[PDB]
């Protein structure tokens, strides 16, 4: 059967947008952990959802985009 999808349902079903929509092994996955006033970058040896990290990432890069866009400006 040939189906036509909209953006919404597509993005919920398809991994092409943000990565896998379930937990997979992400090679090089790191996080920052505090050990007595010291930041350490440590590996996270546990599967996680790439799309879940992407929704954080998309907003964060929108913010840093705005920062560059305004850095030579008045406001």
């Amino acid at each position: 059967a040939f189906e036509i999808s909209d953006f919404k349902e597509h993005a919920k079903k398809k991994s092409m947008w943000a990565g896998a929509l379930n937990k997979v092994t992400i090679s090089g996955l790191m996080g920052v952990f505090t050990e007595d006033e010291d930041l350490m970058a440590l590996p996270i040896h546990r599967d996680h959802c790439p799309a879940l990290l992407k929704i954080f990432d998309e907003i964060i890069v929108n913010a840093t985009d705005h920062e560059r866009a305004c850095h030579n400006k008045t406001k």
Partner: protein, 323 residues
Amino acid sequence: KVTYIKISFDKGVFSCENDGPGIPIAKHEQASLIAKRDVYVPEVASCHFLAGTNINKAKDCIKGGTNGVGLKLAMVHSQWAILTTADGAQKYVQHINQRLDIIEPPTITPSREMFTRIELMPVYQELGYAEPLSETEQADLSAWIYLRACQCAAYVGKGTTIYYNDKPCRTGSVMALAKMYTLLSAPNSTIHTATIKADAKPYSLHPLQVAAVVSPKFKKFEHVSVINGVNCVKGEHVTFLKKTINEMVVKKFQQTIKDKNRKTTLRDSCSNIFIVIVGSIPGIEWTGQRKDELSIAENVFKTHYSIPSSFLTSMTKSIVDIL
């Protein structure tokens, strides 16, 4: 069944034709309701983004297709294209031109043939190439397509011939692929072979075929993977083989060495290896439309798959010799 996949590349024109059941020559209701005119299924399949038979993929499905996008990507990068498809009672010819801007109405006749053919001219100039293609660009692109066809010929089933520019593609086995890739670095070499099986469905339905060469004149680790028909370049299947071989290599290296103190890692273990891995894996996901990298939990292989010990032993032997 699909008994053949004919691929051709000549004077810039690119063509691909298969002979299973054709694409349904039938009116698509919802697509016509959207378009306010008569739209048939091949027009949806070729001109409607996010559309196809894989929008709702099963967890056991081993087709590469998933997004309903690839075919329209081909059309959008075509100066002109021709979709021809026949279902045994009708033939259907539709021309799709100017990067999907001109979609001519289709022409439907009676025919008793059954096949699907896409034929197109890319926009080589818009994409950075000469018009027409230079001698070097033409030769490079022909070689690359020829390679992809050889890869298909190893992945495809045994009743299916892969043709490129009308010659059949030789390489129906991962051993043939390994020999092709190592003909220069290491001619006349030893090919370690394994069929990696799983015990639980769906994985047990899809054994992975593996061929590896081990040479001192290999400078880094290297793999070729066809997974679900996709020539992808990154995925935890590779790491599964790498880690397994490394654990055995470390064990036997400390055994064979009477130094008994030196510590080697995966780079030492694997930098003299060239591996070809071909087959299907159910339930995988990708990191984008290109499908460069498959996404999976590593434990899928730790739980379900086993690498035959004869292959591991052979490999470890060759590698520890080199060490």
